[PDB]
Design a protein around this nucleic acid. Structure first.
Lengths: 99, 100
DNA sequence: TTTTTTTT
DNA sequence: TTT
């Protein structure tokens, strides 16, 4: 009855932080920086870093906590949602950090 | 691009769009959009999940939103996340126009 | 806080 | 669905 999709490509601001709920469900909280770089009206470069709170639950949360490092380039697809603040609940994750 | 920040929403406004102007006279339109999701309970019961989103449209797009959108209007939005967290609308489609 | 009409 |  509705579409709620978010797509993010950027780098992690810090190591993923894995926690567990009272019910023992894995929750992984992450900060992703998407960088927009644009020259403005006076030919002056301006860098505008957007920070995003990304949340991964269950297996995906633990996979993220295992393989993702501070500064890792990563693709995320998920839902927009607000809880407790506004966050992206990850549904898909793709490593873009290969060598 | 040095990054990808893309948001896509289909939903219904919860209220009339609200348009205001900045000190520079630039049109700013704020909206509240709802995306509904329905699933089944542990007991198999229907359970509605609703997410509300603050959507902002600037300039001409902001005026077009204020001009055609109303309470309950079904609408497609496409934009970027900005953080208070907001979806800045870059693209909009009125979905209650050509339904059949 | 507030939205949803045939239909998954 | 869920810190």
């Amino acid at each position: 009855r509705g579409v709620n999709k978010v797509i993010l490509i950027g780098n992690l601001g810090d190591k993923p932080e894995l926690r567990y709920t009272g019910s023992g469900t894995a929750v992984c909280n992450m900060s992703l920086a998407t960088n927009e770089t644009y020259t403005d009206s006076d030919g002056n470069e301006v860098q505008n870093t957007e920070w995003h709170d990304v949340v991964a639950w269950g297996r995906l949360g633990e996979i993220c906590n295992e393989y993702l490092k501070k500064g890792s380039q990563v693709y995320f697809e998920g839902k927009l949602q607000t809880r407790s603040s506004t966050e992206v609940k990850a549904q898909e994750m793709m490593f873009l950090d290969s060598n």
